[PDB]
């Protein structure tokens, strides 16, 4: 029961490992411009570092729930390699973002990728569990 | 053990997709008013499209939480049921505020109602689990 | 199946109302500064209320993913008390920030040492778990 899980909950593990790497970052860019919470505004450095933050924040359960179903209706080990590519390139995302707004892009789009991937193999196990239990029913009309 | 949380993995997915949605509003939104990122300023407009977009990313983790733990707890169908309807509300909700901020109150509390039932039901579920065993040892004083 | 995770389904839903509460301390805090949606900046204090609120509906899904994988992994009641540690700890949060942005600090290294000691159980429960099997493949290797 959680061994056919295992590779997901390492893959979860991992994303929340790199979130407190990206809490890290806006702690030690929060010094290097001497910005003071509550505020969120600063050079267009510190803004960069910190938005980079907030997106990864708000994309990291869409990632949860999508590594979860993909895991659990198709593949574990598919959806943990999806799931070890969406993290990766939103390392690289963080990377980018950190120097200017465009070099955000390209990893940004590998990251898009990795979620429609992961959005496509939950659709597929689901459609193979769903439609042929529908598919026996409607063909069970011609009494 | 997959069938019994089937429903739950579906309207997980739909949630999935509804962000993805929201994202794209957002996007749209960004070359309809020229708001160049890290900027959240713009327009009585922009603000509201992106604001929407903030608060549903925000709120993704607690609608996941109790559909899912409702749906193990009390009926999969029950809380696949307030999970379409929360969904559902949360459309209308966005597409309210990409209007006026007035008009994203009563899909809001429609939101709310839903995601209060989905924690009742999760409660309730958890209340029968727990409170037998209670009852049972706490009536096992007598002796 | 259900009852060996029904700890952490209690404390996932004292997290979802703790989250409810912090909302309506927003609500309330916006009435009190007459800050009109989509507005996040006003006092020194409608800010720190509101940041507190941000804060920790960012750190809820890290929250969920290390209880639940601690809760799986390793001792499910002992995830279950970090998990009621950290939440806790939350509160502290939330009610020292909507104070002053220092007396948040104490209460949020707190929050910190309660979701690195969950990071920590969740890996030695996946430790445990891999390492027997690779120990053994790899002691496979005399021919
Ligand atoms: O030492 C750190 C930095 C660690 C780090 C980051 C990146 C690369 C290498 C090391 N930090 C303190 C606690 C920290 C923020 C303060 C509150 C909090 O909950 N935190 C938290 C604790 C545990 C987990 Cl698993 C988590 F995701 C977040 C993270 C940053
Ligand atoms: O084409 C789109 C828009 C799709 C759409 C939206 C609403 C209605 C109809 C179509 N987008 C690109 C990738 C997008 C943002 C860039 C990064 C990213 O991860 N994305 C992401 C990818 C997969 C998933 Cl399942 C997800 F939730 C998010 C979403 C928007
Ligand atoms: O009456 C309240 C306040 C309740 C409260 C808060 C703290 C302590 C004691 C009572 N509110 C209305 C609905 C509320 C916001 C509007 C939209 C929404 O979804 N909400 C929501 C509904 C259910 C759940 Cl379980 C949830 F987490 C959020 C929360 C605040
Ligand atoms: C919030 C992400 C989805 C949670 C994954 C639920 C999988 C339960 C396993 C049933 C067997
Ligand atoms: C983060 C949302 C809760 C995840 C759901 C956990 C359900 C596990 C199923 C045990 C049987
Ligand atoms: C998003 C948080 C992790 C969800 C927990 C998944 C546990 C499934 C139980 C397998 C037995």
């Given at each position: 029961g959680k061994d056919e899980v295992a590779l997901l909950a390492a893959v979860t593990l991992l994303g929340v490992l790199l979130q407190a790497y990206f809490s890290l970052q806006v702690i030690s860019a929060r010094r290097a411009f001497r910005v003071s919470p509550p505020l969120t505004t600063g050079p267009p450095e510190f803004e960069r570092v910190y938005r980079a933050q907030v997106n990864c924040?708000?994309?990291?359960?869409?990632?949860?729930?999508?590594?979860?179903?993909?895991?659990?209706?198709?593949?574990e080990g598919a959806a943990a390699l999806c799931g070890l590519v969406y993290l990766f390139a939103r390392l690289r995302y963080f990377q980018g973002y950190a120097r200017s707004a465009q070099l955000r892009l390209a990893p940004l789009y590998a990251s898009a990728r990795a979620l429609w991937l992961l959005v496509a193999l939950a659709a597929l196990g689901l459609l193979a569990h769903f439609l042929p239990a529908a598919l026996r029913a409607a063909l069970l009309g011609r009494l």
């Open positions: 924040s708000e994309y990291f359960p869409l990632f949860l729930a999508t590594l979860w179903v993909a895991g659990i209706f198709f593949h």
